[PDB]
Amino acid sequence: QEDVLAKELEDVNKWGLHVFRIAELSGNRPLTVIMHTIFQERDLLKTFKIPVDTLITYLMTLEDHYHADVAYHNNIHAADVVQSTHVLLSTPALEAVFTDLEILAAIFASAIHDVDHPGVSNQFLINTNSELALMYNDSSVLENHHLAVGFKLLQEENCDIFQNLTKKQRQSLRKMVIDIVLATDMSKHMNLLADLKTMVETKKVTVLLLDNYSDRIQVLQNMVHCADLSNPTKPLQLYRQWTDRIMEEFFRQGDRERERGMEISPMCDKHNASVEKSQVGFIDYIVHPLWETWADLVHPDAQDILDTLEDNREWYQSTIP
Numbered sequence: 001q002e003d004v005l006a007k008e009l010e011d012v013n014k015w016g017l018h019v020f021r022i023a024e025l026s027g028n029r030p031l032t033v034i035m036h037t038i039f040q041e042r043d044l045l046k047t048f049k050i051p052v053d054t055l056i057t058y059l060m061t062l063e064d065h066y067h068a069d070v071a072y073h074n075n076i077h078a079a080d081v082v083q084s085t086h087v088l089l090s091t092p093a094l095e096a097v098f099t100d101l102e103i104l105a106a107i108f109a110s111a112i113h114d115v116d117h118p119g120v121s122n123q124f125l126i127n128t129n130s131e132l133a134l135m136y137n138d139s140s141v142l143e144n145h146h147l148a149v150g151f152k153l154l155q156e157e158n159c160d161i162f163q164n165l166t167k168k169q170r171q172s173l174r175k176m177v178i179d180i181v182l183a184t185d186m187s188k189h190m191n192l193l194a195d196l197k198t199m200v201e202t203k204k205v206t207v208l209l210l211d212n213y214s215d216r217i218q219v220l221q222n223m224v225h226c227a228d229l230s231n232p233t234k235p236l237q238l239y240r241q242w243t244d245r246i247m248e249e250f251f252r253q254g255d256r257e258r259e260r261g262m263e264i265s266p267m268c269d270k271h272n273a274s275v276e277k278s279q280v281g282f283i284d285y286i287v288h289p290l291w292e293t294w295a296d297l298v299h300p301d302a303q304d305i306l307d308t309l310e311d312n313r314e315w316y317q318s319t320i321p
């Protein structure tokens with residue numbers, strides 16, 4: 001079983017990694033094994049003097065804080081976003097652009113980005129006067145919580161993977177990680193995309209040139225956002241599983257809403273839903289606009305990813321008539 005897991009992990013640098021198989025083969029530790037593999041591949045343990053034992057302890061702790069009974073926002077999704085970010089960071093157009101600390105920040109942010117997700121939306125939490133919404137004043141409720149949990153877990157015994165970073169490095173990494181995870185809130189999507197489009201329109205090359213923090217962090221924010229919304233760009237067998245899972249989560253939220261006498265949220269009513277129309281809409285209005293813009297920024301590095309997205313959109317559309 002360990003040999004088969006090692007075999008599947010050889011594809012860690014590729015789009016379309018068999019993440020569900022890795023989840024099974026690793027004994028439900030996809031986040032831990034994919035993160036460890038990526039840290040080894042990028043030589044991050046040596047660069048930042050992270051003891052291996054500390055890395056594994058933190059990762060297992062973090063993974064334990066993803067809910068086992070949430071169909072989508074679980075440890076498999078976190079592992080998938082981590083691995084997808086790892087591939088996007090390796091894009092030829094961004095070679096030598098980011099510092100090791102920025103790379104570490106983007107990967108760590110991806111790992112913690114949905115930790116302790118309850119399987120319901122920010123709007124549900126706000127509408128139900130939840131403890132989370134009250135704590136966070138209805139603003140990026142989940143995303144603020146994911147950050148707080150991800151950082152708080154570093155304080156557990158033998159969990160501080162940044163123990164050997166300088167104070168300045170820790171301060172910088174913390175700010176970057178916060179900026180990245182807060183950008184995964186879908187309420188920020190339109191502004192994030194508008195800014196990415198502006199970057200493509202004012203693009204300078206030499207490989208991409210990004211001289212200041214605002215531009216670098218903006219690219220990392222959009223990169224992790226793309227990774228988060230990467231399901232429709234993956235091979236169809238993976239994409240369909242992700243669709244099954246998000247719909248299960250949405251339907252369970254709708255069941256909760258119906259029990260409370262609330263109006264059922266879009267796509268959450270199992271009795272009045274069109275899974276296929278919803279995916280075509282998701283791609284047409286959100287995923288394709290974002291990915292086409294990313295592809296333009298790194299043209300032509302992401303052409304195969306964009307082609308897959310377009311093929312998958314056509315497939316889902318073809319099932320409707």
Ligand SMILES: COc1cc(-c2ccc(=O)[nH]n2)ccc1OC(F)F
Nearest residue numbers: 228229231242243246267278279282
């Ligand atoms: C896989 O499709 C979807 C995925 C998400 C999704 C992506 C990342 C994330 O963290 N949460 N939700 C949200 C909606 C989706 O589908 C559509 F119906 F809107």
Ligand SMILES: [Mg+2]
Nearest residue numbers: 113114142184
């Ligand atoms: Mg999220």
Ligand SMILES: [Zn+2]
Nearest residue numbers: 077113114228
């Ligand atoms: Zn996510």
